[PDB]
Design an enzyme around this catalytic site. Structure first.
Site: not given
Ligand code: FLM
Ligand code: CL
Ligand code: CL
Length: 162
Positions: A11, A20
């Site tokens: 991540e 994202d």
């Protein structure tokens, strides 16, 4: 290797609100803030979670705090899910990390739809599950990562994380 290092690699870490892979506002170590496209909505969420007016920015300690909390909720989510729980307890410790990874990325939900795979994993049919797992929007949308997680379920080692 452990879940935290694992996830930190998948991540990454950002201290400023970012979008994202799916376009949603997030911060820190993959911490989703909201699906709405209103940045202000996102800043509010941010403040709420951190408990202070961040103005879209946070500290490292703060990011890592969210992280902990998030790792926790997820496992906790797994354990509470009737369909998940049994599969998860049938696994060894590395594969467990792999399960957590997925849930973290996709939600209890996203995952609750991998029934066929689940079953295969529960039967310890590594190679089959892996081929199964790949036939997914998940793999097609984020292949590099999905690859790492799948190799993880297939092998039971940290090879893909090197
Ligand atoms: C996501 C997941 C998988 N893949 C296998 C077992 C439990 C669980 F929550
Ligand atoms: Cl919080
Ligand atoms: Cl990816």
């Amino acid at each position: 290797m452990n879940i935290f290092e694992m996830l930190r690699i998948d991540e990454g870490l950002r201290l400023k609100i970012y979008k994202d892979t799916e376009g949603y506002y997030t911060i820190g170590i993959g911490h989703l803030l909201t699906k709405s496209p209103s940045l202000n909505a996102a800043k509010s969420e941010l403040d709420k979670a951190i408990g202070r007016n961040c103005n879209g920015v946070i500290t490292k300690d703060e990011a890592e705090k969210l992280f902990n909390q998030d790792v926790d909720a997820a496992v906790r989510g797994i354990l509470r899910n009737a369909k998940l729980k049994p599969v998860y307890d049938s696994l060894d410790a590395v594969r467990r990390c792999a399960a957590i990874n997925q849930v973290f990325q996709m939600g209890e939900t996203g995952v609750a739809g991998f029934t066929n795979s689940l079953r295969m994993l529960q039967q310890k049919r590594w190679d089959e599950a892996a081929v199964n797992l790949a036939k997914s929007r998940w793999y097609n949308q984020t292949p590099n990562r999905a690859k790492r997680v799948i190799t993880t379920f297939r092998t039971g080692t940290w090879d893909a994380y090197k």
